[model samples]
Target: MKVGIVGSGMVGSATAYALALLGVAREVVLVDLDRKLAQAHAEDILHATPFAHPVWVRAGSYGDLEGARAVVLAAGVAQRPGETRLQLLDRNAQVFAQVVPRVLEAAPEAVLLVATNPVDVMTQVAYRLSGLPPGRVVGSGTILDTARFRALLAEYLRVAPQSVHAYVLGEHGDSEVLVWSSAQVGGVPLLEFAEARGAALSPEDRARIDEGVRRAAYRIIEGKGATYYGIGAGLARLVRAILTDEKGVYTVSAFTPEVEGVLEVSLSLPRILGAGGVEGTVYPSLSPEEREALRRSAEILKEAAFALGF
Candidate 1:
């Protein structure tokens, strides 16, 4: 398998490293405006590949992206300190607009996995710009959030997160929902499992966990600089499913025709991924509150689109 990554910044470089370290691809290419920067990052990881898998890593032009099975768009400007929210999305979208066409020019058949921030709107933008089938364009949406959700649940329950089957749905941002209604641990409903342990999950408890997952990015950005490792792993997981045709269920963002009467926006939901990208979706039974929350999240993205005059 071959993979291409745009942007040699923290997230993009880390993603290339993860792909190389995990041997997910036989060839991994990095692209950036600054060829030297991309070369530096590529060489740094290339030297380490001898200790892991024998994957080829290099920095090259968009032409190098041709024939790759997957290309990740991680190139964009993130929120600088004290930056206004208004200045964020468009800046990244402009970069995306410039890069994606070239990516498609080189790798028309490659699955485009977006990792740019304001991801829901950017995902819609990517799909529209690439003009590929909707299934081929996806955002690394709430996969990391779902990971955090599972980790928190496992931490509280004193069990492995792998044993906790849960999902974070809706947006990749504040309006995201925790699929508590169907959450399970070892095939037992999570609520029942907690109750059996004499610890019921109260509304307050739920809110805390929800808020924790929602605000996790802010906290991490405050402490470190930006979040990369977790997202890199998430993207690797996604790439694996696509390359291996796992057809696995994941909470990834893609354009949905209708979401609770909302339209023309991208958001995260339980979708099955395979060689074609998002093959289909399996929506879980959501409570009225959860359903309404998802609708509101959809509107939030639409509002962003409106702001961008979409």
Candidate 2:
């Protein structure tokens, strides 16, 4: 499969490198305004492919995006320390306005995955600008956050993370909903599993875990100038699902139709991914508390969109 990356910065380059290493794409084209920077990352990754997958990696112009199976838009302003993802919206929207149209023109059949900051809103922005079906345009969404949620649950349960089926839903930012009501470990309710293991998870314990998932990005950004590796893996997962037609259930941001009679916007929810992009969506029964949390998350994104003039 041919994959195109729109930025050559930390996030974009990391994704290209990760894809090359995983052999997820037969070819990866790095597109950046900074030709030299893009070329540098491309060459850096190309040499590593000899030790792994023999995928082709190179820098290219927008025209090179043609015939790609998937194109990831990682180009945008990076979020700074103590800054919220929503704060980066206006600046990144300008960048998206320039990039998404050109990418669509070149690779009309490609699935566009938005990895830029304020991802929920940016996915909506890309959807509006590209005029693509909601399924074809997705945001990295709470995939990374959901991963963190599972990892934390695994640590608390003393089990493999994959054995835990939990999701951090709604927005990918501060207002994200951590759906503890639906969490399960090996098909058993998470709390019941914990009790069986002699490690009962109390309400306070759940609160702490939820806080950790929500603050994960800010903590990582504080330690490093930026975050990429986790997101790169998240991007790769999205690519594999689409290219390989896995139809895997992942929590990603895409335009939802309606909830409580309100028109929808892009946000994270459990979605089945396949060659058709988002094949379908899944909704777990939520506790009243979880449902209220989701309503707040959706409202936050909706208000943010209007606030930014999106």
Candidate 3:
């Protein structure tokens, strides 16, 4: 399968590298305004393929995106330290305005995987600009956040992260909702499983875990200029699901006509993904508080997107 990546910056380049490492795609073409940087990264990853997978990696123009099975939209202004992802809307919106149409022109059939910051709104923007069906455009929403949530809960319960089933819903940013009520370990309720294992979680521990998941990006951005690995890996997983027609469930952002009465917005929800992109969404049972929080998060995204005229 061929995958096209826009913007060869940290997230974009890392995604190419991850895809090559996993052999997720037979071909990866990196498109960037900075042609040299894209070429450099492509060559670097190409060299690593011998040690990893034999995926062909190269830098190319939008025209080269022809026959791509998936195209990742990672081109945008980077979010600075201490900045909320929503704060990145205006600048990144401008970038998407130019990039999305061009990418679709070349790969109209490819699934649009958005990874720009303020991803929920940006995905909505891509959806609007591309004029594609809602299922064709998806955002790297709370996938990374949900991963962090599971990993942390796994640590608390002394189990493999993959054994933990949980989700982070709503916005992929500060207002993201962690579905603690629905969390489980090996088919058992999380709390009940913890109790059975003699590892009862306290309120304080929950609070800390929440903070850890929510603040992870900020902390990483502060320590480093940008965060790539986790999100890059997340994007790779998303692309693989589409390419392989895995029909996997992930917390990816997609357009919803209404979310808790908030009209016409994009936000993270558990979505079934396949070659068609978002096959369907799963609205899991939420606590009253979780539902309310998700409503607010949807409102936030709606307001932001409205401001951008999306």
Candidate 4:
């Protein structure tokens, strides 16, 4: 259960730390253009292992990725001041062009878990660049968003988050859809359960929850400098599913040849995950409105990827 993480920034390093804490991997190698930064994170996380799990953590080159069971691509340049969104995406694409192939060259058997921003599109890029099967290339799409949604609903309903069965589908960004039509709590329909509990979700309550899920990142980034812990934990969970062949169902992103006339895009869907990566996608029945929203989300991602020449 060895893992390789490219990039020692907050997201990557936090993921390494979470993996060690979870004891999901036997070893973790951190690779970055800034060797010193990577080494520093590796050392810090390595020291924490005494209080957590004794996972071997070290900084190394692409060659160090050999024998890795999984590799997380969190490496990318930050958006510069005054840079357009497209320009930032272009820069990250160039980074992936250089990074993805080297990773595949070193660990041909490893599943590539992409965590870079514009993640759905970046994942499509990695899939093409690595020339791997679509299943082998996955993105950390709406997993975090889905978690956020569940947690919020649980808080409102006063239940454990894990007991809430709901999913955030399509893009991981603004266009993502919350599948309320099929949401449930303890095998009962969401609204029905809420009504029985005497706290039925009003239209206003649903709208608030929706806004909370969609704007969570923006609020967090405004309060702090960036977000890491939630995403780090999500990535670690994905890695564990891969390393252990858990066959867990997650709302992660993968290539979809077609969805509502949107062709060749990568977006989040409820997917079964295991050692080989995406096992299959689950298409839960959606409300007509939800279905239309998802179609729009897919179109947004497809158009963005096309604009990037992916």
Candidate 5:
């Protein structure tokens, strides 16, 4: 598949480099306002070819994306130190306005994967502005949170992360919730395993991890100014699901319309992903608390949408 990436910042460049190294796409286009910067990054990346998958890597434009299969929007600033939160959101939304239509103009059928901060809202903006199938546009939501959860589990169980199946859902922001109730280790309930082991899992321990995971973005942004590695690998997997028709079940902040007139929809949900993008969602039995968290997260997003007068 031909893939187009907007913004040639560290995130964008790293994604391109990762995809090329994996041979995930036949061609990779790096889009940036600073042509020289794009070219410089492209050059630096090209030199790694002997080790990476054989692929075409070039600085590209919107027109260059014609007939592309997927476009990843990595453009925009993430959470920065000492900035009022709305200020951060506004800055990224501006980037969204400028580049999304360009992405649509070039690759109308492409699955749009947004990695911009305030990803839920930006993904919604991509949906509204592009008029693509809701399934075709999604945010890199709880994907990272889930990854962190798996990483921690791997450390605890001393097994590969792939063996630990868990989910982190909700806001994709400060309030995202870990679905500890549903977490499984090697197909066994995680809590049950903890109980069997008599490890005495404490609410305070869980709360600490949850808070740490939720604030991970801000922490990374403050330390290094942005976050990309997790999503790069995450997007690579997402692209595989679409292009190769993996149909793997995963959780992403996909805007689901619960029912007709169900004004409170568009939160993250467990989804079946395949070559065509989101094929369906898998809703599970949630505790009252988890269900309430879902409602609150959706409310937050709906308010953001209404703020835009949607």
Candidate 6:
């Protein structure tokens, strides 16, 4: 399948490399506002294409998206050190205003996978602005956060993250909630697994883990200009899901119906991904806290969308 990527920044370029390495797409396009930047990124990845998939990576435009199967819109502003993604909303929305229409015009049939900052909010903007189907537009939401949580758990338990079936639901920010109550370790409940190991447990330890998961991006961005590897792998996983029809649950942001008079924008939960995009979400048995967290995250997205006039 042909895949087109917008923006040649770290996240976008890393995703392109991941796809090329896996041979998930036959063609990968990396576009940026600056032609030189895009070309430079492509040149860097071109040297090692022989070891991965037989794919082509080049600097191109949305016109490259024409007839493509999936197009990832990772084009947007980089969050400065100490800046929250919410703070980047206005700037990135401006980028969307210019980019989305061009993408739709060039590749109307291509499913849109977005990685812009304030991603869930931006994903909603993509849906509203591009006029794509619900399943065709999705944000790389909690996919990375969920990975971080599982990775942390794996380190604690001395196992692979693949063996951990856990989720970080609600938002992709500080307010995001970890559904530890529903987490499973090799088919065993995480709480029970921990208890069996007689792990030193304390409410404070759990809180620290949660904090580590939540501020991961901000902390990483503080050291560097942008956060890439985690989110890049998440984007590649999303593309694979669409191309291979992997109808598995991933915690990404999706639009939802209005509740209490507010049309939901981006809610991060367990969504089934497949050829179409979002088959649906599995809103598992949630505690009162989980429910509240979802509501709060949805509200945050709605407010951000409103403030930016999206």
Residue-level error in angstroms, candidate 1, position 106: 1.2
lDDT of 6 by residue, 189-252 (tens): 8877886676754678678788878888888889987789878877988998887788989998
TM-score of every prediction relative to native: 0.95, 0.94, 0.95, 0.97, 0.89, 0.91
C-alpha lDDT values of all predictions: 0.88, 0.87, 0.91, 0.92, 0.76, 0.81
Against the true structure, what is every candidate's RMSD? 1.8, 2.4, 2.4, 1.1, 2.8, 2.8
Question: Where is model 3 more than 4 Å wrong at Cα?
Answer: 78-88
**Error of model 6, residue 169, in angstroms:** 1.1
Instruction: Kindly state the number of residue pairs that clash in model 4.
Output: 0
Lowest summed lDDT across 10 adjacent residues in model 5 is found at 259-268
Best by TM-score: 4
lDDT tens readout by residue for model 5, 195-305: 655574578867877776777777878998668876787877777677777788877776677622336345566788876668887876567787777677777777886
lDDT at 25, model 5: 84
- Tens-digit lDDT track of model 4 for 1-310: 7899998899999999999998989999999999999999999999999998789999999999998989999987878999998798899899999999898899999999999998999999898788888899999999989999999998988899999999999999999999998999989998889986866999899999999999998888999899998899899999999999988899999998788788889999999999999988888879999999999999999988888888
Question: Residues 71-187, candidate 1, lDDT per residue (tens digit)?
Answer: 998888757887777777677788888999999999889999989887788888898888889899989999999999999988888889998999998889888989898888888
Compose the digit string of candidate 2's lDDT tens values, residues 146-231.
Answer: 99999998888889999899888888988888888778988888778888896598889988998988888888789987789989
Q: Clashing residue pairs in candidate 3, if any? A: none
Error at 288, model 4, angstroms: 0.7
- Candidate 6 Cα lDDT to native: 0.81
- Residue 275 in candidate 3 has what lDDT? 97
**After superposition, candidate 4 runs with Cα above 4 Å error:** none
What's the TM for model 1?
0.95
Model 2's TM-score against the true structure: 0.94
- Which 10-residue span in candidate 6 carries the lowest summed lDDT? 258-267
Given candidate 2, what's the lDDT at residue 263? Answer: 57
| Ranking of candidates on lDDT, top first | 4, 3, 1, 2, 6, 5
